[PDB]
Design an enzyme around this catalytic site. Structure first.
Site, PDB file in Angstrom:
ATOM      1  N   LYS A  75      65.991   7.865  42.745  1.00 44.30           N
ATOM      2  CA  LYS A  75      64.873   8.809  42.798  1.00 44.30           C
ATOM      3  C   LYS A  75      65.164  10.068  43.620  1.00 44.30           C
ATOM      4  O   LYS A  75      64.934  11.187  43.155  1.00 44.30           O
ATOM      5  CB  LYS A  75      63.617   8.130  43.353  1.00 44.30           C
ATOM      6  CG  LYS A  75      62.997   7.089  42.432  1.00 44.30           C
ATOM      7  CD  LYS A  75      61.692   6.571  43.026  1.00 44.30           C
ATOM      8  CE  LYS A  75      61.082   5.460  42.187  1.00 44.30           C
ATOM      9  NZ  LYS A  75      60.689   5.913  40.826  1.00 44.30           N
ATOM     10  N   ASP A 122      55.075   9.358  39.878  1.00 41.78           N
ATOM     11  CA  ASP A 122      54.764   8.199  40.727  1.00 41.78           C
ATOM     12  C   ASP A 122      53.522   8.437  41.576  1.00 41.78           C
ATOM     13  O   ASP A 122      52.685   7.549  41.731  1.00 41.78           O
ATOM     14  CB  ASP A 122      55.918   7.869  41.690  1.00 41.78           C
ATOM     15  CG  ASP A 122      57.091   7.186  41.007  1.00 41.78           C
ATOM     16  OD1 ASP A 122      56.858   6.300  40.150  1.00 41.78           O
ATOM     17  OD2 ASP A 122      58.249   7.525  41.348  1.00 41.78           O
TER      18      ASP A 122
HETATM   19  O1  LIG Z   1      61.046   1.413  34.086  1.00 42.22           O
HETATM   20  C1  LIG Z   1      60.633   1.209  35.338  1.00 42.22           C
HETATM   21  O2  LIG Z   1      60.735   0.098  35.816  1.00 42.22           O
HETATM   22  C2  LIG Z   1      60.059   2.325  36.128  1.00 42.22           C
HETATM   23  C3  LIG Z   1      59.646   2.084  37.377  1.00 42.22           C
HETATM   24  C4  LIG Z   1      59.040   3.125  38.298  1.00 42.22           C
HETATM   25  O3  LIG Z   1      59.910   3.298  39.420  1.00 42.22           O
HETATM   26  C5  LIG Z   1      58.816   4.510  37.596  1.00 42.22           C
HETATM   27  O4  LIG Z   1      58.790   5.544  38.579  1.00 42.22           O
HETATM   28  C6  LIG Z   1      59.941   4.799  36.556  1.00 42.22           C
HETATM   29  O5  LIG Z   1      59.717   6.064  35.935  1.00 42.22           O
HETATM   30  C7  LIG Z   1      59.965   3.687  35.482  1.00 42.22           C
END
Ligand SMILES: O=C(O)C1C=C(O)[C@@H](O)[C@H](O)C1
Length: 501
Positions: free
Chosen positions: A296, A334
């Site tokens: 991230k 998020d």
């Molecule tokens: O596919 C996952 O597990 C995801 C999980 C979260 O961390 C989101 O911020 C992502 O965008 C997608």
């Protein structure tokens, strides 16, 4: 190269009668053909058994009699092994697979004796890595030089960046080519065959009948990844992460893409090094990405342009490769996703100081006080002194002030660590609402013990779906089909302990 990719089902039952049933199951599941792995038969009466299979199989047959020296189960006389293959050909097989090592000899022994609807596949298996384009080309030429009707090259993925070289091979080699990269890191090569020219891909009858590492099931290829819809122009998207096998993003986005007829496919992207990944897949074919642990923050740095909210938060979970200049734009869904889920459920204790912690923490301050508890203190410290908040030693979390809200943004509790929780049940009393960003399992130990504590619980699914439909809007440029995503998650994203790898 030519027709869309076929889907071949590996048949490994150790008994002929069981193999016959598998070939029927293969047809039921939707496979285009079956690879009979003769080397897996416990008892084998060549003439009698081959005949039975060819006679009873409802799908075209491909016979393989893999030797121990090529990674198979066969041991013994080489000529006898070859006799079986020639026997399969003369009994009516649609294909036989012969190892490159003995290909020339074999092909010469059947010269002018090949039936009409018969094709010889000459294969090469590399269990160490994925060679350079230079070496791969040499391999293709060698295989062609044997007189093969179809070229099969199976390599190993040391890194996801390796797949790109296999795609270049299937996409540009002017001869039918089955190009696959084994291992979880090579999964993407088994899924996008139709976009990149692959002649066929292998899909399992079920998640336990794997003939090679990384093979997905036929049902997932067809219904999860929408295999039949993948073409030379489909745009590729994916969830970047490590681990990533638990991600349900491929489930929801592929369903949504299909529903609105958007020409895209979404896959799992197990990425070790974010920078090398982005550089290895910079073409327009790769239009957008979702980012989870531990990429991230790194994603923020890799983006040429970054959205205010993202740059402000300090983390990116959505990357869009703009068609114009072709640069990477970073976004963050998020924040709105988790914050909204929490408000819907209705001082914030945020466990974790990674990208998800930053986003939630940030969003929270933008509305009470927020404490950042994290094992690695330095991390929690940096964050704490950014949103104007207080840090906290993870070990001291079990003590604290009431009516507070708890928000776990760490991977603690995520499958397979189903008995792990970021905080003691006795300490949950001091909390009014508990949120867990972990959505696999839907009901973590934290959320379970939280409910038994009388606190209100906001499942990760609530945050996951929300951040997901916002990403759909970013990737497609189409209005977020919110109701659709909730429906898709409910109908297709409820099974637990699923690993796509
Ligand atoms: O596919 C996952 O597990 C995801 C999980 C979260 O961390 C989101 O911020 C992502 O965008 C997608």
């Amino acid at each position: 190269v030519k027709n869309p990719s076929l889907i071949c089902a590996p048949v490994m039952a150790d008994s002929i009668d069981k193999m016959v049933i598998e070939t029927s199951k293969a047809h039921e599941l939707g496979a285009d053909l079956v690879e009979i792995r003769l080397d897996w038969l416990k008892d084998f009466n060549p003439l009698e058994d081959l005949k039975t299979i060819i006679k009873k199989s409802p799908l075209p047959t491909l016979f393989t009699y893999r030797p121990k020296w090529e990674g198979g189960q066969y041991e013994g006389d080489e000529n006898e092994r070859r006799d079986v293959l020639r026997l399969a050909m003369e009994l009516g097989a649609d294909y036989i697979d012969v190892e490159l090592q003995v290909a020339s000899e074999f092909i010469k022994s059947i010269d002018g004796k090949k039936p009409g609807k018969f094709k010889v596949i000459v294969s090469s298996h590399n269990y160490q890595n994925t060679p350079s384009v230079e070496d791969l080309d040499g391999l293709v030429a060698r295989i062609q030089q044997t007189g093969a009707d179809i070229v099969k090259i199976a390599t190993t993925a040391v890194d996801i960046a390796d797949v790109a070289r296999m795609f270049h091979i299937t996409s540009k080699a002017q001869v039918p080519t089955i190009g696959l990269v084994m291992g979880e890191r090579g999964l993407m090569s088994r899924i996008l065959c139709s976009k990149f020219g692959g002649y066929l891909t292998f899909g399992t009858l079920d998640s336990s009948k794997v003939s090679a590492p990384g093979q997905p099931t036929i049902k997932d290829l067809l219904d999860l990844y929408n295999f039949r819809r993948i073409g030379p122009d489909t745009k590729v998207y994916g969830i970047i992460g490590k681990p990533v096998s638990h991600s349900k993003s491929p489930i929801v986005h592929n369903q949504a893409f299909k529903s609105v007829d958007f020409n895209g496919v979404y896959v799992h992207l197990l990425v070790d090094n974010l920078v090398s990944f982005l550089q290895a897949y910079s073409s327009s074919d790769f239009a957008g990405f979702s980012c989870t642990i531990p990429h991230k923050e790194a994603a923020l740095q890799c983006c040429d342009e970054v959205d205010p909210l993202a740059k402000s938060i300090g983390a990116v979970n959505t990357i869009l490769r703009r068609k114009s200049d072709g640069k990477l734009l970073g976004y963050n869904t998020d924040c709105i996703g988790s914050i909204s889920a929490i408000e819907d459920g209705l001082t914030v204790v945020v466990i974790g100081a990674g990208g998800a912690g930053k986003a939630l923490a940030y969003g929270a301050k933008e509305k009470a006080k927020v404490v950042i508890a994290n094992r690695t203190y330095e991390r929690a410290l940096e964050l704490a002194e950014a949103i104007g908040g207080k840090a906290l030693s993870l070990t001291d979390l079990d003590n604290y002030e009431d009516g507070m809200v708890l928000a776990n943004t760490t991977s603690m509790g995520m499958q397979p660590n189903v008995e792990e929780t970021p905080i003691s049940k006795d300490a949950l009393k001091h909390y009014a609402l508990v949120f867990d960003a972990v959505y696999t399992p839907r009901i973590t130990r934290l959320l379970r013990e939280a409910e038994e504590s009388g606190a209100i619980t906001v499942s990760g699914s609530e945050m996951f779906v929300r951040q997901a439909y916002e990403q759909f809007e970013i990737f497609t440029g189409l209005p977020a089909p919110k109701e659709l995503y909730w429906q898709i998650m409910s109908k297709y994203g409820s099974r637990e302990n699923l690993y796509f790898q």
